[PDB]
Amino acid sequence: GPAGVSEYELPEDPRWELPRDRLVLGKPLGEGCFGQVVLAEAIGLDKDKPNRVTKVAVKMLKSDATEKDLSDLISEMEMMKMIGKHKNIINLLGACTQDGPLYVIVEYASKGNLREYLQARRPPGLEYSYNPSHNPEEQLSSKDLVSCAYQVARGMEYLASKKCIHRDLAARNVLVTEDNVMKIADFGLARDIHHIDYYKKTTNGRLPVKWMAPEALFDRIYTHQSDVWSFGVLLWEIFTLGGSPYPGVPVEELFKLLKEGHRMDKPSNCTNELYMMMRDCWHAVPSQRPTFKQLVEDLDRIVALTSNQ
Ligand SMILES: *CCC(=O)Nc1ccc2c(-c3c[nH]c4ncc(-c5cnn(CCN6CCOCC6)c5)nc34)cn(C)c2c1
């Protein structure tokens, strides 16, 4: 029965391949660029414990995907293998490349992306915009917030040590697990070979130009230093509990303003020290920004000294 055999040579890796009859597909987790992502229960994911079920996220390839799309999803899966596992990244768990459509299985983070996780925990009052959630959750302590930043910085320190550049580090690309662990998504994506549209929103309405370092805006240069710039924007997102960068600023104006030295103002509830860290990440000169190793050390100290009261 050649019915439904792929015309392509999809790479079977015995360490990672899972029979798809071990997956019980559940609710949707949203549209990715390559296709749906769906929650599933995987049976015997760990060969040590074959009778146990694990919740996982299954990245699928849409039926009308192109060959570039297929190649990009394979490239991300292979890059995840080379980068290796870390607590603060979305890890590869397995793949289904035989006997049906391509599935790439990655970790499930039940609380969803960090922007909406923080927005649902906004308290009332003057320091934050309103809470948009119809299921609002308990507010985080100051220490929790700095610990969110620390965990993302630790994940980025790991990725940079593996020579992985993220290129779109933003609160919407951080997921939060049931145990409130921060996990960076999309670090393994292959870079587009075509020029980008600065004015095209993501499927979730975001304008990624607002996280771009000026050398990426102006000259399309991305380094670990430009990821540190983005991390500064992510810091501002954290201390506004999910705010939208550059409020009121039209995107066509952003490079002119940045070039003239405009930077976002300090959020109302943010220490001078954390605002200085944000501003250091936004140094005009890439060589003068802190490294992720340095951000990790400083945030570790700040977490220790920040009240959870
Ligand atoms: C092209 C790049 C791309 O498509 N990237 C991409 C990467 C990962 C994911 C996911 C994904 C992976 N792992 C996940 N775990 C959980 C979730 C998730 C989605 N919604 N929720 C629930 C949020 N609610 C909020 C209200 O209270 C209950 C929880 C969890 N998503 C995960 C998903 N997608 C689309 C991509 C794309």
Q: Mind listing the domains of the chain with CATH numbers?
A: 5-106 (3.30.200.20), 112-305 (1.10.510.10)
Helix (H) or strand (E) holding 82: helix 67-83
Residue 21 assigned to a binding site: no
Q: How many other C-beta atoms are found inside a 10 Å radius of the C-beta of residue 291?
A: 14
What are the residues facing 182 on neighbouring strands?
A: 176
What resolution (Å)?
1.9
Residue 107 among known ligand-binding residues: yes
* Mutation probe of ligand 1 site: the residue of 59, 60, 91 with most atoms within 8 A of C-beta: 59
- Cβ within 8 Å of residue 161, ≥6 positions away: none
**Angle, vertex CA 72, rays to CA 151 and CA 92, nearest 5:** 40
Q: How many helices (H) and strands (E) does the chain have?
A: 8, 8
Q: Are 214 and 286 in contact (CB under 8 A)?
A: no
For residues 299 and 235, the answer to whether their CB atoms sit within 8 Å is: no
What experiment produced this structure?
X-ray
Using DSSP, state whether 184 is helix, strand or coil. strand
| Cα separation, 102 vs 117, whole angstroms | 30
Residue nearest to atom 1 of ligand 1 (CA): 33
User: Ligand 1 mean position to 185 CA, how many Å?
Assistant: 9
Which amino acids are annotated catalytic? 168
Ligand 1: does its nearest atom lie under 6 Å from the Cβ of 104? no
Ligand 1 centre and the CA of 113: distance in Å? 7
Q: Which of 175, 178, 192, 204 to mutate to test the pocket of ligand 1 (most atoms within 8 A of CB)?
A: 175
Integer-rounded Cα Rg, in Å, for the chain is 20
Cβ-contact 115, 238 below 8 angstroms = no
- As a whole number of angstroms, the distance between CA 301 and CA 303 comes to 6
Tokens 């399309």 belong to 220
Euclidean distance between CA atoms 243 and 236, whole angstroms? 8
Does 243 count as an annotated binding residue?
Answer: no
Distance CA 146, CA 211 (A): 20
* C-beta 92 within 6 A of ligand 1: no
- Nearest to residue 91, comparing CAs of 187, 180, 14, 24? 187
How many CA atoms, within 13 angstroms, populate the side-chain half-sphere of residue 220?
Answer: 8
* 243 DSSP assignment: P
Atom 6 (ligand 1) nearest CA: 32
DSSP 249: -
- Ligand 1 midpoint to CA 107 (Å): 10
Ligand 1 proximity of 254 Cβ (cutoff 6 Å): no
- Centre of ligand 1 to C-alpha 36, Å, is 10
